[PDB]
Scaffold this active site. Sequence first.
Site, PDB file in Angstrom:
ATOM      1  N   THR A   1      35.683  44.028  42.228  1.00 32.97           N
ATOM      2  CA  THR A   1      35.437  44.396  43.719  1.00 32.97           C
ATOM      3  C   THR A   1      36.985  44.763  44.211  1.00 32.97           C
ATOM      4  OG1 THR A   1      35.530  42.195  44.551  1.00 32.97           O
ATOM      5  CG2 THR A   1      33.441  42.987  43.788  1.00 32.97           C
ATOM      6  N   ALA A   2      37.055  45.858  44.724  1.00 36.00           N
ATOM      7  CA  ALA A   2      38.426  46.426  45.517  1.00 36.00           C
ATOM      8  C   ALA A   2      37.779  47.578  46.433  1.00 36.00           C
ATOM      9  CB  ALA A   2      39.334  46.957  44.357  1.00 36.00           C
ATOM     10  N   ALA A  15      40.991  43.530  47.848  1.00 36.85           N
ATOM     11  CA  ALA A  15      40.150  43.191  46.591  1.00 36.85           C
ATOM     12  C   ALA A  15      39.938  41.716  46.416  1.00 36.85           C
ATOM     13  CB  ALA A  15      40.761  43.676  45.453  1.00 36.85           C
ATOM     14  N   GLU A  16      39.475  41.236  45.236  1.00 34.18           N
ATOM     15  CA  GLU A  16      39.084  39.929  45.157  1.00 34.18           C
ATOM     16  C   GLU A  16      40.117  39.340  44.569  1.00 34.18           C
ATOM     17  OE1 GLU A  16      35.703  40.449  42.423  1.00 34.18           O
ATOM     18  OE2 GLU A  16      37.078  40.610  40.826  1.00 34.18           O
ATOM     19  N   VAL A 126      34.953  49.776  44.173  1.00 33.69           N
ATOM     20  CA  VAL A 126      35.163  49.678  42.526  1.00 33.69           C
ATOM     21  C   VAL A 126      34.983  48.205  42.052  1.00 33.69           C
ATOM     22  CG1 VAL A 126      36.893  49.675  40.723  1.00 33.69           C
ATOM     23  CG2 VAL A 126      36.825  51.721  42.358  1.00 33.69           C
TER      24      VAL A 126
END
Lengths: 182, 183, 220, 218, 223, 219, 218, 219, 211
Positions: A1-2, A15-16, A126
């Site tokens: 995730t981003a 992001a994460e 993403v």
Amino acid sequence: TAIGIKTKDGVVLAAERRLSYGDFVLSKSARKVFKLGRFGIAGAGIVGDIQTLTRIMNVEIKYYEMYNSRKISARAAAKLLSVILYQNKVLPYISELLFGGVDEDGPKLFILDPIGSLIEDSYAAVGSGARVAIGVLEAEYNESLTSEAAKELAIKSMKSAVERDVMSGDGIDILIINKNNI
Amino acid sequence: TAIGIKTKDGVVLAAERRLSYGDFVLSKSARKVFKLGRFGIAGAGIVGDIQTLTRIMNVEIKYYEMYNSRKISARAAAKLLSVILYQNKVLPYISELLFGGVDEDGPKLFILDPIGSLIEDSYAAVGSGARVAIGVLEAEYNESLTSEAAKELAIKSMKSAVERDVMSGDGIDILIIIYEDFI
Amino acid sequence: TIFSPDGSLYQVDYAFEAVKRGWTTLGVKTKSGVVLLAEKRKATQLLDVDGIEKIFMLDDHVGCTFAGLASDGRILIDYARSQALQHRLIYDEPISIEYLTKVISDVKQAYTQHGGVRPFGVALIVGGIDKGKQPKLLMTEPSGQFMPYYAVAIGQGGYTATEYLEKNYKEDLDIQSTILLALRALMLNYSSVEIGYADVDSGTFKKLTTEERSDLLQKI
Amino acid sequence: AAMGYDRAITIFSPDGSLYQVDYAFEAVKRGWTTLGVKTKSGVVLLAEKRKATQLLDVDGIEKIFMLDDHVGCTFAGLASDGRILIDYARSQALQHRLIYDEPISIEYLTKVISDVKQAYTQHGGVRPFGVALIVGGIDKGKQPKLLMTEPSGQFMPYYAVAIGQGGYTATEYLEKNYKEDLDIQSTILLALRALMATNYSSVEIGYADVDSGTFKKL
Amino acid sequence: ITIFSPDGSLYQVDYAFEAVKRGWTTLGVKTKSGVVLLAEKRKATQLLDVDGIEKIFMLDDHVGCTFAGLASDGRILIDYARSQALQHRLIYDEPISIEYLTKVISDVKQAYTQHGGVRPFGVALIVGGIDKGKQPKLLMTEPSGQFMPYYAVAIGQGGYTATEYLEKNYKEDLDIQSTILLALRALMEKLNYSSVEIGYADVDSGTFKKLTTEERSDLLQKI
Amino acid sequence: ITIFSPDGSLYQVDYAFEAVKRGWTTLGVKTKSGVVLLAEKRKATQLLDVDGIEKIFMLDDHVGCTFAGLASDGRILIDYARSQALQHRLIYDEPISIEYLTKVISDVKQAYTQHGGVRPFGVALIVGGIDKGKQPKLLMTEPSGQFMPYYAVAIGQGGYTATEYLEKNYKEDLDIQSTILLALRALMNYSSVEIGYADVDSGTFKKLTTEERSDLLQK
Amino acid sequence: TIFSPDGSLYQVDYAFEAVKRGWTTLGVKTKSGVVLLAEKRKATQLLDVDGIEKIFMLDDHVGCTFAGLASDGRILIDYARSQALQHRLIYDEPISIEYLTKVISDVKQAYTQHGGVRPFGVALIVGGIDKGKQPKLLMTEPSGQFMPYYAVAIGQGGYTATEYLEKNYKEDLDIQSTILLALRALMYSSVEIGYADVDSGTFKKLTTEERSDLLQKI
Amino acid sequence: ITIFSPDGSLYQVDYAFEAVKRGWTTLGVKTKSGVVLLAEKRKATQLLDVDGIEKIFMLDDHVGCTFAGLASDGRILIDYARSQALQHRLIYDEPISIEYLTKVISDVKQAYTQHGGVRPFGVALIVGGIDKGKQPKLLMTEPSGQFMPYYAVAIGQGGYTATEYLEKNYKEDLDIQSTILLALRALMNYSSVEIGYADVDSGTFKKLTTEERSDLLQK
Amino acid sequence: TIFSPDGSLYQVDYAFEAVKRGWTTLGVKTKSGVVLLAEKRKATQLLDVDGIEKIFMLDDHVGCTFAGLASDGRILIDYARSQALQHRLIYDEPISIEYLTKVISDVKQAYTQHGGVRPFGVALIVGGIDKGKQPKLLMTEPSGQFMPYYAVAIGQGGYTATEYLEKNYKEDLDIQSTILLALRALIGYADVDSGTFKKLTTEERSDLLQK
């Protein structure tokens, strides 16, 4: 995730910070957002591919900056990163990437595939929970935002992806790129 | 999805601006129509193969234009692009392409396969919704068209492909051969 | 591969002296078309000089002749034909003559810059008419230089034909009249000349037959 | 200065000078006269086209070459050495434009060209180049940038130079009446005047202008 | 030639060192809180673009060096140095020690002074940098391939005069305006304010940058 | 070795042509009937098996040739010629044109007259080929790499004497028996010779019979 | 690469004259342990002789010094360290010194037998502890010969230290007494000293205060 | 090395042929009944194992040969000959023709007489086999690369004396005991000679054991 | 790599002069033993003669010594050991001595026929006893020639030991009488009973000056 968000002021990335192989979390602190001078990238996928692409691009940004007397434009570094991804099509760098910077042409945000396709878009996500996060972005994105309001949108969208994606989770860093401060 | 229409006055190209991997749309704005020199190409498939083929062909168009002192013809650039696609048969450029230009012989439109087969037609479509879009073209087409009437035919056919293909939609670019007007 | 104090390469000038000792070859380019021919001197009365060849056809549009040594310009003719057919395999297009003479002349340069390689002792006078604009005609020097010419001739009697073509040049001419001019610039018999012409109407090149060049060479 | 050390090229004379490099610079002194001027308003470089034989294509011969849509240059000395060097320059320029999708800095073009000249002045069985280049372009964000390549491999960026047979005469004329606060019709006039101190249509002229960032010929 | 004289000296190396004696004057000083190195830019022709010609090259963010002698030999050697530095930073993600940079540079010089059909380099280098913490470091590359780390040297036409001037007044204590002042007083046409090229590395912020054209004028006016 | 004299002549090539002038006399004649080429076999020692010495070599069943000068240079050159011929027949399943065989032979001679640490060949060849459905063509290879197609030549020690004899009484149309007679007369002798002929009726090249060699030697 | 009619290679003997013009380096072996040191002469006031290096540490138990040229023995030191670490990666064992000096000396031979290669103009003296066979010292000559020595010294004053060590070389020395002997053989801190001791099987180079106090003793 | 003299002769090849003239005397004789070749073994020092030093080498079970001149040049050439023979026997499962063995040996000699930085071979070979059908077979390799097939030759220090003795009285066929007698007479104690023969009845060549040599001394 | 008009290569004879300037090395072969030894001159007093090596062991069964230069015959000893262990890896068999000296001598030939390579200035003498017959001794000359010998010695005093072994030879000796003979002509020995090449330790040499 981003998540990248394009504002009239500057590009915001977030992001994460979670890595899990299989069904098991190996690390609660895995950096997936990296700085490159004025620029910044963040992607999802295998961590080792992402880390070596931050390091290779850091070297070749210094390559271009030491030879030519001009600092790098984001379109040039994006096409460079697309060619670096594209030469290794047989064994692709398994990573989808977000490339964000500000040039004299304006704020620029970029999407890169492991094959090496370059896409310009305003807002993007993403990775695993990207589906969920773009839903939040598709609800509440406008072209006229401020930098810190887009920070709050990135926290809202990433928090939705934390609650509804098993591969994402807690730990959020945010890179605010206006021209004066990185 | 990408459509070329051959008129007496020139060649009209149009394609989608949508990219979706799997069942999920990554981008609502992905350019699949490109203008190189005196003409334009547009195809469908993997975006990175199409983008690197626009860049390679742009370099070698300038190669031919500098070293042979004349400008370049569309049959020559098509045969060049067929050889460029064909040398990499082991690792094929996964992309079907439409090549459109105007020479002194007249308007020329070209279809290219990832292996590198060159086909000269009048009207063509390429990609997911090409089946649907060629249906619209096979209804209303004539050899005697105008440039802007063929634009409206491309808008009608692409709009049918928008409503009935789960891969195309959103906006559609247009190159007439050069003006470009996005509606 | 040593530079002289003045800056001249002596071996290149010696190779240009070797082509001065060659047979007389001619190339003329007018407003009408391209004609190039070559003298065929008979040193022995048992030569198959009707079977010997000095006009070579690079492609169906472009031909050329050499002077100086035979073997150096002959392996250079094989490279030219290979480069031309390679361009026609890639682009399915006839080849520009600046590019053919380019890569030929670049080969001559590459053998005039490396140590254990003798330079070429052959000058070429290429001339094709496939371009849609006008005709072309160039000359390759063993240094690797281009000179595009309207009409030249090099060999033993090269300077005499050079001054004759300086006397009576017509830029606009007939193709029968420009082949007439080259025959006059060479001065022979039935079996002492090879003639080839390229014409702009049907874009092709051809060397002449034995009872066609003879019927025109009687006229003088 | 001791001049028994003219064998091959990979050998220092006792003063420290390479004689074959200086001999190659004598080969460009025997070349045709080529000129390059840059002021502030843009770029003019030109070259004399002398007619040795009445049957010569003075208008068909080429000496101004276009490396990219934004950089042209000319050579003097031999033809073939600077011509194979022109093929390397165009290949390196289009390679940089394929990678970065960006116009090329001229310090990098002349860099890699000049590095090739060095590599042929350091290896045994290779003759050095007997050609000097003068390179002019304006695709940078600043203003014009003129460089000159010497067969030793050295850069010298110049406001205006000329090398060849009448190179020193044009060098002293441009020393007389040059100045920066000047425009493009007047700088092409200045280069024509610098060639006149040394003709119907027997000169190639090329200019690059800063308003539309491109290079053209005449 | 790559042949040994009966005394044991290689004559071409000493001849190449005579070629750098015919070079322009370049200076390097290393004192207790940073690095200053500069190079003279003599104007042989009025038409030279002197303020655009380059002799100070930046190997890394923290390493800058200059050359004397020929241009092209030390310039292709500067490309190899930058390539080795960026390769080390790709492997270790770390700034590079100067003993290793000058090592591989000097090993290339040795390899061209031992093989037959290769001319040796006719260029001497002086390399400076902040490394990683500690203090500054300065080295000089000789065309034989030898290291000598120096506190302060200068080589070129006026190299021996600058060597003897820095022999006179080498103040241990380093300042941010006195270490650049000493190099400006060790250079000797009167001095122009846009015809000399200066670069410094300072230990507080571990980086290297050439002085801007305005900084050249403001510093050269105190003399 | 790879250096031009100021007149432009390569001296090492002319010295190699002096080496073939010191070779044995070899002969080649072509007529409308076909091809005859032969070579003298001089006996320097009584220990020599002249019956065992070979100088006529068969490149293909329609192409034969002989050499003069050194033995080993033209012999390694004969191996390259046979390899190129059989490669063309493997590709095209066709007999080989002689302009292409002599082409690649002559290109090898050129390549050894342009590179530094290689001595040029000191051997001249004379090749007789009927090709396919065409009159036989004879070509001679010089160590410079030049072609000269000839009606009839002879090179070696007595090469000029046979050259002037064939200048006296050679024409275009006559028999195979009369052209083998003509070549024997040009070599000036009871039995020391190799004779090979190619005839246009059955397009093939043959060798010694020792039956017709004695019979035709008596005329 | 040509033999003289007596049979001697002249270029090798010229390289041994080049190490005779080198600085004085010393190596001594007693039953107490290993000491080797090297003179550091100061040609200029501005030379950082505090930062110059001539004692190099091949492994934790092998150190050596060179004399003659610097760069030849330095690229030879990179080959020695590479061969040592390669043997330690294969066998997970310290390396025999006869094998280290073997492959070093074989490289010297290979450059004294091929045409377009200059021989090395550097002599090495290698000291270590290896296993437990008391000391182990070798010397590399540019011909490629081994000579193992109890104690030698080569350089400008090499023969004087050789004859001094011929006078008073004694077997029953302390490690403190054998470093004393090398200092006496060299006749304040322009010398750098390294020792290997048999009790803890490792190499150590002397710090500033260590060699300072030991010099102030004798 | 690789330069023609103006007459056309290569001087280094003739100098290498002078080097084989300084070699030991080796002999080869070839009659209609079989093959005998032998070699002198001169004793320069009183400590040689002359009964163990080797000059007759066995190339195949049916072809073998001796050298003169240098030792090492013809010895590495003997390894190449054995390798070429066993390669042909691996392909065709057939004994090797001797024209092909001497061909590839002689072509190697040519290749070292045409390239710059290579010394030519200073060794001449004499090769004797039986193959299949051509019982009496003998060839000689010259360092120029030339073939000469011989009935009987000898080269070395006393090579011309044995050449003129073998020139004397000798007819075509005789028993193998008489041709080994002829080679012993052409050399003018018991183990100063080492002798090998090939016989046409059993198509091989065993070497002489020294016991049969002792039987051939006293008779 | 150039022939003189007589046909002799001068550089080979110059390399043979270089081995004439070498130390004296000895090799003697009897019908019951191999003994070969080498002199160890002490140029300097600091040189440990008892630490310098000149007898090298090629295989379990073969040792040899060199004279002339050190480094040329030493890189040649690595090739000899490598060729021996390669033959023993393939066939699991001890190596014939004609093949070891063959490939060694072929390397010497290859460096006496190519342009930019100096020939070897080292002669070797090889003694192996792993054959089923008796012992075998060979000598390698820098031209590349074999000569198998009963007993030779080369170096500075090579001709004096050569004439001494010419005086008092014998076919049938002990191990002890043939090592006596080599010491008189001025250590490693191979014996045919246990087929190995033994090197004497530092004590046994003290027997031989005494006995």
